[PDB]
Design a protein around this ligand. Structure first.
Ligand SMILES: O=C(CCC1CCCC1)N1CCNCC1
Ligand SMILES: O=C(CCC1CCCC1)N1CCNCC1
Length: 330
């Protein structure tokens, strides 16, 4: 089997992307944030505290003839931006882009933190990291990809995110028309539960490539690119007036600037992030100070190849017995 679904940015600056997911019988379609950096499929629901729902579409398990309460199971997840969500668990039929999994754990939120209530366009998350990170207790549950894997034509999914435009998540096949050149594959460590890999270095604009190992995660659920402070300083030094602001929590730059590109290495291959992908717009409405898309990871503990980086590539998440990642230009 295979599946293919379009993923759409929530706003004009790609602050997050959403993909329609069918849950239950008859289907209830929710728009979920596909997150290769976590491993829970959780949704706003009829069980979510009413004051914490503000425009999201909810899953109502009582209206699904295939829903079954997973007795005694609870979940709780805290994310690195200070947000959180928790609740109970159903199993139900879940389909993405024509690919169907029966008995998928659907984690129904009883509580969500403000950043989730405030994101009216995101009805939940669909985790695509390794199932060892799934938070369901006392019986850990498998991700949608883990459940689908054996049925897929090939045990892979691909992320093809667009810059200020829709893109595609495919399951079970590699669309050879969706990229240019060749896909370069690189080793993955699953030891921390992530699609963790080591970039071979970077370049700023037309500058020379610096060969240096940068360990980080491929995280569709992260919007920006988080790299070591040395690398980030070298990038922003090429933008007149750019500075790290203590009030903003990171690098800002004059909105009048033209940003240089940023290149990262995948083995001997190179992925070029155009400068415009690094512009996240005014810090507040009407400001001439703009949010940078490359930020320091120093306070995170790991580097994060988020959407800023991934949207410059066609990315293969190869879930074979020994997982690997593939990157191609497009
Ligand atoms: O990219 C982030 C926060 C990333 C943080 C960096 C380190 C910890 C997490 N998003 C996506 C958009 N919704 C809010 C959360
Ligand atoms: O903060 C995290 C980790 C989430 C934890 C790991 C699994 C359980 C919770 N991020 C940033 C946002 N994208 C996903 C990765």
């Amino acid at each position: 089997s295979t599946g293919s679904a379009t993923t759409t940015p929530i706003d004009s600056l790609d602050d997050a992307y959403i993909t329609p997911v069918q849950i239950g019988t008859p289907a209830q379609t929710l728009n979920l944030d596909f997150d290769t950096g976590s491993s829970d499929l959780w949704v706003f629901s009829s069980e979510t505290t009413a004051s914490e729902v503000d425009g999201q579409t909810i899953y109502t398990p009582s209206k699904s003839t295939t829903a079954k309460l997973l007795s005694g199971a609870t979940w709780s997840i805290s994310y690195g931006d200070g947000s959180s969500s928790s609740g109970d668990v159903y199993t139900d039929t879940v389909s993405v882009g024509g690919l169907t999994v029966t008995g998928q754990a659907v984690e129904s939120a009883k509580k969500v933190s403000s950043s989730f209530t405030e994101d009216s366009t995101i009805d939940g998350l669909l985790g695509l990291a390794f199932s060892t990170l799934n938070t369901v207790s006392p019986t850990q549950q498998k991700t949608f990809f883990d459940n689908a894997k054996a049925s897929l034509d090939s045990p892979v999914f691909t992320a093809d995110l667009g810059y200020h435009a829709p893109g595609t998540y495919n399951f079970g096949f590699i669309d050879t028309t969706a990229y240019t050149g060749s896909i370069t594959y690189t080793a993955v460590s699953t030891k921390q539960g992530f699609w963790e890999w080591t970039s071979t270095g970077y370049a700023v604009g037309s500058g020379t490539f610096k060969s240096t190992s940068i360990d980080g995660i491929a995280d569709t659920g992260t919007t920006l690119l988080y790299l070591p402070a040395t690398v980030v300083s070298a990038y922003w030094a090429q933008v007149s007036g750019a500075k790290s602001s203590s009030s903003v929590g990171g690098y800002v730059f004059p909105c009048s600037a033209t940003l240089p590109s940023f290149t990262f290495g995948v083995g001997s291959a190179r992925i070029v992030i155009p400068g415009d992908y690094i512009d996240f717009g005014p810090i507040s409405t009407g400001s001439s100070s703009c949010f940078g898309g490359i930020q320091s990871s120093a306070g995170i503990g790991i580097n994060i190849f988020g959407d800023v980086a991934l949207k410059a590539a066609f990315v293969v998440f190869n879930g074979a017995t020994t997982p690997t990642l593939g990157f191609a230009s497009k």
